[PDB]
Design a protein around this nucleic acid. Sequence first.
DNA 1: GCCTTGACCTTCCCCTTGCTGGAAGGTTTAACCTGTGTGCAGTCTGACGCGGCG
DNA 2: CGCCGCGTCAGACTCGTAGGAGGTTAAACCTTCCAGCAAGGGGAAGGTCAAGGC
Lengths: 235, 50, 130
Amino acid sequence: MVEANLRLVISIAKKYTNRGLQFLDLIQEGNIGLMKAVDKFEYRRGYKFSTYATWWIRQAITRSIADQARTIRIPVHMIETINKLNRISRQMLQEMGREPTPEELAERMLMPEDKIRKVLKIAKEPISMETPIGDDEDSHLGDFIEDTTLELPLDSATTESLRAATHDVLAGLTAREAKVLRMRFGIDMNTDYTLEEVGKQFDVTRERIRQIEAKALRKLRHPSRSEVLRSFLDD
Amino acid sequence: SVITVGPYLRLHQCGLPKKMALELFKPFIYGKLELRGLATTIKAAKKMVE
Amino acid sequence: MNISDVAKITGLTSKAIRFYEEKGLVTPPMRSENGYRTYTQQHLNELTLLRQARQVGFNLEESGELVNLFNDPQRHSADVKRRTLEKVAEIERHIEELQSMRDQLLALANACPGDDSADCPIIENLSGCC
DNA sequence: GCCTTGACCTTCCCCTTGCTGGAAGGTTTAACCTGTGTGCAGTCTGACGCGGCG
DNA sequence: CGCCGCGTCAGACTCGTAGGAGGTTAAACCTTCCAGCAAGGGGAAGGTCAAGGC
Ligand SMILES: [Cu+2]
């Protein structure tokens, strides 16, 4: 029975090799088609086996087209939405002579705008890093890309300078306050302690710890030492 | 750039438009501004440079 | 049973039934291996009881207790009717105080000129100024 | 500058009705229909290997 | 053995020019997970408003 009906299978797969993916894989899903069609068959009905099989095969492949065929996964529900959308769009094209409007086919479909928006935002596919953007093979699209991710050496050196000036100032304030604030803000280590934990390391206090913070602010506020950061004011 | 003639040059010399060099010797200048105390930092230096 | 057929028979929908089962408000219906909630004539009448219980006024909890009553063939019509009557009383209090509120609203509104004015006497009766 | 000391605020998670809507993910219909292709690609070409073939 | 043919591999450098896609292939029946509403209420954990004792 597998070897009975292979030719209908290829017939349908080539009827649908209107260019979704490729020939052979489709043909092979059709072969699984035929397997499960035969592996459960009701004979009592008295019809031809082949048609029962046929629609089972149709469903198998018409899924597998839509699961794969994009490196992005868009599950099936969105897929048939797009399908019926365009099935309506063709007839809007005729009976308008003109492209559609989101509100009009929203009315005709009876469903709301922002879905159509994000659909058409999502409906489109990726465009191949090495496409020939030049007139000739001048250079492909790769040159026209930025590494907008990593660093600025300017800002890196600027941040080093921030750090230098800051610990230079911390030398200028109280050892207690400066050290306790290096650790309270997590400087000079990996992790950031908090009010009570810094306290009960040091000692039990809570609110005079706050007032030690305000003290250090007054010590820093001090419009003679700001000038190592009065430009980092603008940083 | 495009080139033209200096018919008075001392050949080991070269012609040069400035602003090109102004970009090309930039962080040099930044360091030297910081060194002379004029612009002690880099955005200060850069603002003076602009 | 077929879960949609059951929900249409009781008028509810499936997530309603599921919400009630989450709240432990009926006999547990089994699933099938595919996962279809196996309802029953037992669940039919449990759900119809639990349906009209709140339309009457019995909440999720006391209506679960009513399905307990039904699932209790040892039940006592007394306590049933006593709770029916406690409900009558609570509805009475509700009616009385809602109509007290109504009367206050009507005293406010008929006292208003409705003269499309900045002089809306209602709001200044409501607001603690002046 | 060491201590609370009391008492007030702001944020952030979590909870209490009766559901509702959404998203992602599954499984079956008996009238049928049996070998593509489908637009390439316009033949660049001289030196050089090597398979067959005498 | 000495052709004959087929088959692979090569085909200067540096600047800039334009942004760019397209046509088509079920529907029903089910499953599980969470967002969100009133109208707020508890409650954690940092704080933060005054005020003291040396
Ligand atoms: Cu009024």
